[model samples]
Target: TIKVFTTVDNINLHTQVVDMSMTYGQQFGPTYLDGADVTKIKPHNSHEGKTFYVLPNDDTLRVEAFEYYHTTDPSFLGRYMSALNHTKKWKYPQVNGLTSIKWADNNCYLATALLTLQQIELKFNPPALQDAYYRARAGEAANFCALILAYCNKTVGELGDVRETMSYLFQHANLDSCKRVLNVVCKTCGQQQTTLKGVEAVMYMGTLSYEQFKKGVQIPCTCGKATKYLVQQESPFVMMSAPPAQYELKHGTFTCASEYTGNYQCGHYKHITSKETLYCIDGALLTKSSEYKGPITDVFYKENSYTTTI
Candidate 1:
C-alpha cells in the first residue's frame, strides 16, 4: 500500500532549526548531526529530502513533530545565567547628582525598573535556568544598559557646569535670607543695622557657647526692640570652599566685617606714571622709580570691576 504525509510548518520551531543547522544541530534536536549536509538542509521543516520516521499502522498516520529553540551560545547563555543566578543583595544604584529634570526622570525610570525586579525576585523566586529568570534578567539588563549609556554620554564638563550652578544656588539661598533680614532691620532702625563691629562682637560667640550667636547677631537699636538682627553665622556659604564674607563683601551690600583680613591679594597691580601711563609695578616699572604713585591701579574684582582707595 502506498502512503502519503504532510508537514505543518511551525515558524518558531523552524527558525530555531535554521539557526542550529549552521552550528550544532543536536542543540535543537536529540539527533546530533554534525556535517556539511545539515547546513545544506534549510530550517523549514517539510517532508522533502530530509530524514523522517515511519510509524506502524493499518493506514498512514501523519506524525506531527514539535521543536523549540533557545540560545545555546555559551557567551550569551552565560550572561543570561549570570543575571538569573545573581544572589547579591540588590540595591538601587545611585546616579550622580540629578543636574537636570531629564536626568532626574531617567533616574526615576531606573528606580521603577529595579523595584519591579525586586518584586519579581520576592514573589516568583525563579530558578536560575528557567524562563522566568531569563525574562527578569532581560528586563533588568535593558534598564541597566540604558541608564549606563545615558550616563556615559554626558560629558564631564557638562556635569561640572551643572555642579557650579547648583553650588551658586546653595550659597545664594542663605545669603539672600541674611540680606533680607538686614533690610528689614535697617528699615525700622537704620542706625542699628548690621555693622562690622557687630560682626566682630559675635566672632567669638562660638567660643562663648551661644547657640543664638550661631545664627544671627543682635545690634542695639532705639526702635523699642533692644536689638536689630543680622544673620551671618549659619550662612550656607559657610560650608562652601570660600567664606560668605568673601562673596557677600564683594557686592558691598552686606554689613558684615568692615574689611577682610585674609590674604586679600591683588591680581594684577599697575602703577600709573605721572604722565598717566600705566605700568606693571612688579615688572620693569618698579626698577624705574620707588616713589611711583600716579593712581596705583589695583584691580577691584567683585563679580566685576570697581575702583576705590587702598
Candidate 2:
C-alpha cells in the first residue's frame, strides 16, 4: 500500500506494506521512477527516465524516478533494519567474476548457500548485529551481513569475523547477546531434566515401600546429604477457591527468608511442607491451589524431599 504526500520541498511516499513475498520479482515504486526523470535529482548511473522494454510498442519507454528521502522517524529506521535483516541474509543474487557465466553462477551458488546458513544464526539474534558493529569484527559482521546478502545477492555491506566476535562475547561475559540468544534457544526448546545415575536411582524411588508411602521416599542427595523439605503448594487443611487465590506454589513477587509464611502464604520463596506446618492426618503435603480442579488433599505430593544447600 503506497500513500503519496506532497510537501513544499518534495513529495513524501509512505509505503505501509512492501510485497516482498514473491521469491523472484522486481519491485520499483512510481516515486522511484518519478525521481529518476529529473537528471539533477537522479542518482549516478540510474535509469531515471527509462521505460519498460517489454511493452507492446518497441519504442515505448517508461520513465523512472528515484529518491533517497532522508527519514528521521525512529519506526522508519526500525522497519528498514527489519527489512535489511530479512533480505541480505538469505536470498539475494550474486555475480561471479569468472569469464564463463556458468562458472560464475556455480561460484555464487556455492558461496550463497554457505552464507545463508550463517545468516540464519545472526537473524534470530539482534544483539549479534550491535555487538559486531562496536567490536569491528569484520568476519562476525560478515555473518550478520550475509543474511542480507542472501536476499540481495549483492555484497554491498561489510562482513565481520563472527567466530572471533562470539569468542569475545564469551570471554567478556557479554551477556546481552548471549542471554538473548540463549533465552530464545532454551525457551523454544523442551525442558531438559537431568536423571539420577548409578546407585543413586536405587535409593530415591526404589526397592522399598513403607506403610504410609512417605517413609519409602527417604533418600539423600548424591553426596549423602539431604534437606528436610516439602512441596511449597502442598499443605493439608488449606481451603481452596478463596480470596488471594489460596496456596500458591509459585509466587511472582520478591521476599525475605526470615519472614517466610510458606509458598505464597508470605513471599516469593517456595514454602515446603514442614512437619509442624502439615495439617493432614497423614502428615503429607496438601495442595489447595487452583492448579487442581477438585478439593484439597495430600495426594499432590509423592515424595517429601529437597536438596540441601551446602
Candidate 3:
C-alpha cells in the first residue's frame, strides 16, 4: 500500500511584506518632496504635505496639517505620535513613528521601512530612545520601521544622496545572492544526460529557489496551470530609502503634534535639523521642550510657526 501526503505552503506564515496603503493601492514614497518635481503635491493626493503634530498639554490627538506648498523640512508623523503619547501611557508601549495610513483607517500595513533601522539607532541614544518609547508601541515592526527611518533621516544631517542609502538597503536584503546561487545551479541542472536523469531531477528542485528577481525588481513567474499554485510573490518588506514627497500647507489635511505645547511637531523632520525647536507649542519657540527654556514667543521661532524660519 502507498500513502500520499499533503504539505501546507507557508506563504501566509512566510513573513509577508504588508503595506496598508497598498490595499488602497499605493505605498507612499519618501516623506520629503522636491519642490522642482511637478509630479507631486496635488490637491487630491492623500499624502501631499499631510503633517501631524502634538498640541500643548493636550493628552488626546495630534494636530493634522494638510499644508500644501510647505517646505519638506519638517514631518507630520512625528507630531501625531507626540500628541498620541497620552494614550500610550497605559499601554506603556514604546512609540516609534513609522509611516502608515492609520489616519485613513482599515488594513494597517507599513510604509517607511527605514524607520526600523532608525529605531535601532536610537537604542544607543538615551533621550531619543526614551522619546520613542514615550510615543510608540514596542513591536509594530512595519510602522516602527517607517517611523525610525523618518527619524533617522531627519536627525542625521547632511545626507548627500538619498538614493545611495536606498540602494544599499536593496543590496542588504540579499536577493542578489539568491539569484547568483540559483543561476549557477540551473546551468548544471538543465543538462539532460541518460545516466544522470535522476540526479538532474534533484538538481531541478534546488534550482526552483534560484531566482533572478532581486528586491524591488520585477520578475516573471509561471505555475504552468490556471490555478493559483505555489509561487514567489514580491511583497515590499521595507520602504526603500528615498527622498520624501513634497509638502503643502493645505487646510483639512492630516497633521500631528505633541503633548507639552499643543502645537504641531514632526520629530523625524526635527531630527534632521535643530532639536532646540518644538512644534508642539501654539507659540513659535522651544520654551517647553526639556532641551531648552525660554519664552514661547521668542526670536528663535516665528509666532505662528513657519516651517522654514524655525
The best-first sequence of candidates by TM-score reads 3, 2, 1
Tens digits of per-residue lDDT, candidate 1, 159-275, equal: 212123223222212233212122124345444334232213212321111223334445455665443333333221211112212212121211111111222232222212211
Query: Where does candidate 3 have its weakest 10-residue lDDT segment?
Result: 5-14
Candidate of highest TM-score = 3
What is the clash count of model 3?
A: 62
TM-score of 2: 0.17
In angstroms, the error of model 2 at 101 is 13
List runs of model 3 lying over 4 Å from the truth.
1-72, 76-104, 110-184, 188-310
> What is the lDDT of every predicted structure here?
0.24, 0.24, 0.23
Ranking according to lDDT, highest score first: 1, 2, 3
Clashing pairs in 1: none
Model 1: weakest 10-residue lDDT segment is 297-306
Indicate the TM-score of model 3.
0.18
Error of 3 at 80 (Å): 4.3
- State the lDDT of candidate 2 residue by residue for 1-310, as single tens digits: 2222211112222222222232111332222222122212322233322331111111111111111212222232223334344333433222221011111211222232222222222222234334433332233233333322322323332232222222222232222221100001122342223333222211212211112222222334444433222112111111111122223232211110011112332221111222222211111122233222212111112222333231
